[PDB]
Design a protein around this ligand. Structure first.
Ligand SMILES: *[C@@H]1O[C@H](CO)[C@@H](O[C@@H]2O[C@H](CO)[C@@H](O[C@@H]3O[C@H](CO)[C@@H](O)[C@H](O)[C@@H]3O)[C@H](O)[C@H]2NC(C)=O)[C@H](O)[C@H]1NC(C)=O
Ligand SMILES: *[C@@H]1O[C@H](CO)[C@@H](O[C@@H]2O[C@H](CO)[C@@H](O)[C@H](O)[C@H]2NC(C)=O)[C@H](O)[C@H]1NC(C)=O
Ligand SMILES: *[C@@H]1O[C@H](CO)[C@@H](O[C@@H]2O[C@H](CO)[C@@H](O)[C@H](O)[C@H]2NC(C)=O)[C@H](O)[C@H]1NC(C)=O
Ligand SMILES: *[C@@H]1O[C@H](CO)[C@@H](O[C@@H]2O[C@H](CO)[C@@H](O)[C@H](O)[C@H]2NC(C)=O)[C@H](O)[C@H]1NC(C)=O
Ligand SMILES: *[C@@H]1O[C@H](CO[C@@H]2O[C@@H](C)[C@@H](O)[C@@H](O)[C@@H]2O)[C@@H](O)[C@H](O)[C@H]1NC(C)=O
Ligand SMILES: *[C@@H]1O[C@H](CO[C@@H]2O[C@@H](C)[C@@H](O)[C@@H](O)[C@@H]2O)[C@@H](O)[C@H](O)[C@H]1NC(C)=O
Ligand code: NAG
Ligand code: NAG
Ligand code: NAG
Ligand code: YA4
Ligand code: ZN
Ligand code: ZN
Ligand code: ZN
Ligand code: ZN
Lengths: 412, 413
């Protein structure tokens, strides 16, 4: 099998620092006291460099052979806008990129921009900008001339996978569709990305290429909320239309942003599953004061069929933050292998569709395992009542507004 | 502020402890003798009731002293005849103490060391992997990385970084390999390869700019109440001291248990240069043999150190007045003394303690009278130490190697 790494939502806090005053440990705790801070971080803080470095060091010495890596964005930390700048955002993105380039000098890496990869956060523009030009220079070792051009202009690109003939990564800037982005309200095709996408998929079809879609913010519905698409409904519907029509060219979709481990199955209006969608959890464990849960840090690995790119498996690795802070050593370890964990043959839309049918059933243990993995095993005492469970299952299976409304109507 | 860490040792839980009319049934550890005057927190002829250990940890938890870590130097099973214990029962007691600690202090890194009772039969700790070594590796996994786990499983020792104190590394030796009653290690130059490993570890700490705390159960040096009786066999004491003297600029503290007493030692080179300070902490158990006239009150202690630096600033000894707690049926864990305050020294550096023990040596020194009262953790203010006793004490405090100690006894007995 071939395989590739997926990391996302690094969220470096350069001010991380263990000290007596726990309000003064990380700017990302937002002046609040870190709750239980260690060298690898705190649930109220974004990532210390030690955390991110231990993640990449684990990948490097994992004994796992991978031919590329996808990196779906969000490197700067959660601090107030006035505490950041264009210069500081570029500095953080540069530090992450150089960390990866130094540690992995021969691995092609496919980054996507996240909503924090810009100053001010979430305001990613539909024309060229300092941040887009900067990341185009930063990621030149991995991208051709045409990808550099589109990235500099709109924050998105496509690129052939050098080590995998017949595979192409499409890296979308889905922050253009993200609710908080006040730069793109009421535009029908912000930065022409839709027209660009269709052109690119059309060319991949005729060059007999397979396509992996990557982006930061995903399609579909936020699984913990009611009727809340991750991106604006209008853009979600239009993107999903493109994905459904090209579902035989697209062999996988990969997203981050939610900081959780979620599955989705893109389906038609009739219940034919068409593509498999994978939302990866964050390296940062950060949470607000009120939130009951957060994720353990996570990195993950995908296995696919050589020269074919059908997804065969996924391996989710994680770091137990409380224990790593307890002993002062990062024990990055196997959380689960998807096929083994859910007893499915592979990751094809059909296998996952049948597995989520099992999820639906009453007191499904499959769904309990899934819910425990949603938080990257942060808390097995976490529970999901039947309202919670309906919201989750309906978001997993129904990506478009009408399938989703029908699911909630029939099952809430 | 300053950094602080706790030291507990020799818990010696007796799970049979039990107030009943027949005082030969109060505790297996009295070995059928009549408990003297048993109360809820123990008896001088018994090992620790679980109520006593839990009161010690409860006091630590609710003391209002912050601490970034704890060291725990061994001996959890009680003193009962070998045929009354087993490997399974030893593991069961060790597990209970570990879980008690993890339950009350879930985010406190603890650094355990094995004691000579932490094995069945007692004292027979082996030089290869074993049921108990594996089990405690399992048990202590939350606090220890992969390399520590590997050495612990094989020989019962490890080193480990202090998560909360970067630049600090705990070395937990298994000195029971050197302990006279250990029949598994006779005529062995480096049992379980611990010396070789220790030297390697210290060399690594040198080049990684780490300071080191040595912890173990059985101490180096000479038993302060006897003549010419090293706590571990002479051959091993000399070898270990040679290592400690050579690395005494890297080692910022040594901490031991086993003697159930409050004792100081100053490791010195052959010319009296005080090199490195040694703290033997008294036990939680108050157990004593029938003929034995004195024993210790239960004790636990706290060390203060310079942050990012690990020079030792002070030590606070806390104790339980056993008779008082048993009289009312409620404990009152309380300050026995602060070392700088008790002895008017500036800190815990070798030079400061060296000067202090020079004062000890003077005739009718009040400093040494206070020290000898604290030796039993204040168990008897009428316990006295004649001039022979004093010479044994002072010479054991200052002279850890046989040559030094012989020289001291010659000049002063
Ligand atoms: C720990 O608590 C015990 C019990 O409270 C303390 O022992 C008690 O100490 C008092 C004061 O010395 C003793 O009373 C005195 O006895 C003599 C005659 O023996 C008498 O002349 C005095 O007027 C006074 O009554 C008392 O007997 C003794 N109790 C027991 C059970 O031994 C002990 O001092 C405490 N330890 C520390 C370090 O404070
Ligand atoms: C991550 O590590 C922590 C600490 O080592 C684990 O916390 C323990 O969890 C169990 C219940 O799940 C309790 O019985 C223990 O008392 C907890 N703490 C300690 C100090 O023992 C936690 O289980 C680990 N996470 C996972 C997914 O295994
Ligand atoms: C450790 O052992 C103690 C003492 O045996 C436990 O507390 C006792 O639990 C037993 C259950 O067998 C009860 O019969 C006793 O009444 C309890 N109290 C006393 C004072 O004996 C304690 O629960 C154990 N702890 C762990 C973590 O296993
Ligand atoms: C590092 O993490 C792994 C995974 O949690 C630990 O290995 C497991 O340890 C548990 C607890 O003893 C066992 O139940 C599992 O069977 C182990 N699995 C494997 C594959 O070994 C490992 O011990 C941890 N290392 C340290 C030093 O804490
Ligand atoms: C879809 O693509 C067709 C083929 O495009 C040409 O050939 C492929 C192999 C690529 O090299 C591509 O870049 C070339 O331009 C076009 O003939 C057709 O016009 C396209 N259709 C649309 C609607 O864009
Ligand atoms: C003493 O240590 C020196 C330092 O190098 C170490 O190398 C590896 C093994 C790690 O432990 C690393 O942390 C250290 O920097 C060695 O170069 C030297 O050979 C060692 N000498 C002896 C005699 O052991
Ligand atoms: C943080 O906790 C400390 C507890 O010592 C308290 O003094 C301080 O006021 C707290 N600050 C905030 C912002 O909660
Ligand atoms: C990135 O920042 C970290 C944290 O300040 C620093 O340790 C590291 O050297 C930096 N790396 C690069 C390549 O700038
Ligand atoms: C213990 O004391 C009881 C009651 O005074 C006495 O009958 C018994 O002989 C004593 N047993 C031993 C072993 O000393
Ligand atoms: O990192 P962000 O893009 S601000 O937000 C994405 C995730 O982290 C915080 C939010 O609650 C959401 O779960
Ligand atoms: Zn994020
Ligand atoms: Zn985001
Ligand atoms: Zn003991
Ligand atoms: Zn002992």
């Amino acid at each position: 099998v071939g395989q590739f790494w997926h990391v996302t939502d690094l969220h470096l806090d350069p001010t991380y620092h263990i000290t007596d005053d726990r309000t003064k440990v990380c700017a990302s705790s937002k002046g609040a006291n870190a709750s239980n801070p260690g060298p690898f971080g705190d649930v109220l803080c974004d990532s210390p460099y030690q955390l991110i470095l231990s993640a990449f060091d684990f990948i490097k010495n994992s004994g796992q052979e991978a031919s590329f890596m996808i990196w779906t964005g969000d490197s700067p930390p959660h601090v107030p806008v006035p505490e950041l700048s264009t210069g500081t955002v570029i500095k953080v993105i540069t530090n992450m990129t150089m960390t990866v380039q130094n540690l992995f000098p021969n691995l092609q890496v496919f980054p996507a921009l996240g909503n924090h990869d810009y100053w001010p956060q979430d305001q990613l523009p539909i024309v060229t900008s300092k941040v887009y030009s900067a990341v185009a220079d930063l990621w030149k070792p991995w991208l051709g001339e045409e990808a550099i051009s589109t990235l500099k202009k709109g924050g998105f690109y496509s690129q052939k996978v050098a080590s995998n003939p017949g595979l192409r990564i499409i890296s979308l800037n889905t922050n253009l569709y993200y609710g908080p982005n006040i730069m793109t309200l009421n535009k029908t095709d912000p930065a022409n990305q839709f027209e660009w996408l269709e052109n690119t998929l059309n060319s991949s079809l005729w060059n007999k290429e397979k396509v992996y879609i990557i982006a930061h913010v995903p399609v579909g519905y936020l699984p913990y909320a009611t009727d809340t698409p991750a991106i604006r409904q209008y853009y979600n519907e239009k993107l999903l239309d493109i994905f459904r029509r090209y579902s035989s060219v697209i062999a996988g979709q990969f997203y981050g942003h939610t900081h959780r481990d979620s599955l989705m199955v893109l389906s038609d209006k009739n219940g034919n599953p068409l593509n498999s969608v994978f939302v990866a959890p964050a390296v940062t464990p950060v949470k607000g004061v009120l939130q009951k849960e957060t994720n353990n840090p996570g990195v993950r690995l995908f296995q696919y069929k050589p020269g074919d790119y059908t997804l065969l498996d996924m391996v989710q690795y994680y770091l137990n933050l409380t224990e790593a802070n307890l002993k002062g050593e990062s024990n990055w370890t196997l959380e689960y292998v998807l096929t083994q964990a859910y007893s499915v043959a592979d990751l094809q839309p059909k296998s996952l569709y049948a597995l989520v049918q099992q999820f639906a059933t009453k007191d499904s243990k499959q769904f309990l395992k899934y819910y425990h993995y949603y938080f990257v095993s942060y808390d097995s005492s976490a529970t999901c009542d039947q309202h919670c469970k309906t919201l989750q299952v309906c978001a997993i299976m129904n990506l478009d507004s009408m399938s989703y409304d029908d699911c909630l109507k029939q099952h809430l």
